[model samples]
Target chain A: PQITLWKRPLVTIRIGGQLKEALLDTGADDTVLEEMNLPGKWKPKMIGGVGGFIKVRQYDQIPVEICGHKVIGTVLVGPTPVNIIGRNLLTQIGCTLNF
Target chain B: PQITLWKRPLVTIRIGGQLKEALLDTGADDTVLEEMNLPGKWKPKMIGGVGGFIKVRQYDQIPVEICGHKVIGTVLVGPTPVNIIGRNLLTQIGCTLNF
Candidate 1:
């Protein structure tokens, strides 16, 4: 699917059985979700992906529905300004950059 | 001009008559250039964007060549991790998001 950069590349995604709007960010390294309680165990980690240095909980092997595609990958949950679907999950859904 | 998101969406761009590589960022709001000299009148301003907040010099009406497309827009010069081409210039280049 082709998306215009005219506005923030915001798309709806389902994670942890909750639907939320997220930004399709090619600049980031990991998929970061806003603070939320996710099932199972997670480890504390610090990450700085096109954002301020922040500590987050790393949840691995999580199934997320991004733009209708189901994929399992690592997801970091923290105090992000917005949810971001970074390259970690973007690639699973066959997203690309075009000019 | 399609690119896979499996890697950083880095591309060559021309600004201030110099060639440099920049990331095609759809999450950022403004085009932020790392520390550099651009001949023109600029004013001191502070913006955070995706990373930590940083003060920058804003130069308006700046002409930039992004992947061969010539576009004139506001360019912020600061100590960013890298040069970023935001939606302001991205729209002018006819970039779109697709699946």
Candidate 2:
């Protein structure tokens, strides 16, 4: 089956701190970094992506790896055209994708 | 019957919340404001969205408008360059796309 082409994980983003290549998108739920390739200490949190039941304020958990799968939390700093690997880190790793 | 599609909602987004067209995407589950668009107020957050049991805490909430309806909470606020309507905004409202 050659794993059947699910493929929904790709990491490499440290931005100002330095790292690139991020593309984990469950259509981008959230977990973004592109503000001109952010990495400037970080600050900003006001909730809602859409509709209701929304309240965001993420910051204070940096250190991500994939395949090897390292983890941390709070990361949203935008300033670019846009580059995402969201869906809240694929729902914290229970992960699901098929297309 | 001319009624075979269920489109989701579409609203651009209000960084400063001055009324814009915001789109509701289900494939991507969560609220996310573009980096603070209209009127200017691009703050950053710190929490996480890729992997989650929902513990986003980088804080702040403003800017959003969909069609004419209203609701709130959404900010990942970075410097985007990938501005996408992921899942293509679920093919524009009344959504459903399994490709």
Candidate 3:
């Protein structure tokens, strides 16, 4: 499947059986979602980005549905302005920059 | 041509005849580069991101070479952690999210 690149490239993603909109952020190293509850345990992790540093709960091997594609990987829960689908998951789904 | 999505998706870009490494950020609306001299007139603009808002100099219709592709569009210059190749130029290069 191919998804057009919008100015923000907002896409619908399902995590923990909940649907949410997330930005496809190639600049991000990990998938950082707005704070949410998960079924499994997590470890505290810190990440830095264009803005600054943020604390997150790193949940391993989490299954998430991005545009109907099921992908299992690390999901970081934290205080994010918006849900971000980072390269960690984008690679699993075979996303690429083309011309 | 297709480029793999690294965890950070860093790529080589040519702006103002200078080569620099940049992040391919689908989350950004416009391309932003670290402060540099561009051979054109610019207008004042403001952009907001994960951290906060920042002021920038917006140069329109500038040609930037990314991964051997030539794309011309809005290029913002300001203080930034790194060079970001946003969707504004990515779309011109026919970028897409694939699975």
Local distance difference test, per candidate?
A: 0.86, 0.41, 0.85
Q: Give model 1's DockQ, 2 decimals.
A: 0.69
State the lDDT at A15 in candidate 1.
83
Off by over 4 Å in 1: A49-51
Q: Score the docking of each candidate (DockQ).
A: 0.69, 0.05, 0.68
Q: Over the stretch A22-98, how does candidate 1's per-residue lDDT look in tens digits?
A: 99988788889999999988999888744468889999999999877999999999878889889888888988777
**Tens digits of per-residue lDDT for model 1, B1-89:** 99888789999999866999999988887899988988879999888644457888999999998877999999999878889988888
lDDT of 2 by residue, B1-99 (tens): 011112323435434435434443333433444454333344444433333223322223432333332434434433322222333223223233221
Task: Point out where model 2 deviates above 4 Å.
Answer: A1-99, B1-10, B15-23, B37-59, B82-99
Name the candidate that leads on lDDT: 1
Question: Candidate 2, which CAPRI tier?
Answer: incorrect
Task: Estimate, for each residue in A1-99, the C-alpha lDDT of model 3 and write its tens digit.
Answer: 776776567889998669899988778878999989897889998887655678899999999998888999999999888999988999988888665
Instruction: Place model 3 in a CAPRI quality band.
Output: medium
- The per-residue C-alpha lDDT of model 1 at residue A62 equals 97
Looking at candidate 1, what is the lDDT of residue B5? Answer: 88
TM-score of B-chain for each predicted structure, in order: 0.93, 0.38, 0.92
DockQ of candidate 3, scored on C-alphas against the true complex (2 decimals)? 0.68
- TM-score of structure candidate 1: 0.93
Write the residue-wise lDDT of candidate 2 on A1-99 in tens digits.
111112323445553356677665444445666544334365555433322222333555666664345566657654322356455654554453222
Inter-residue clash pairs, candidate 3: A51-B51
Clashing residue pairs in all predictions, respectively, total: 10, 82, 1
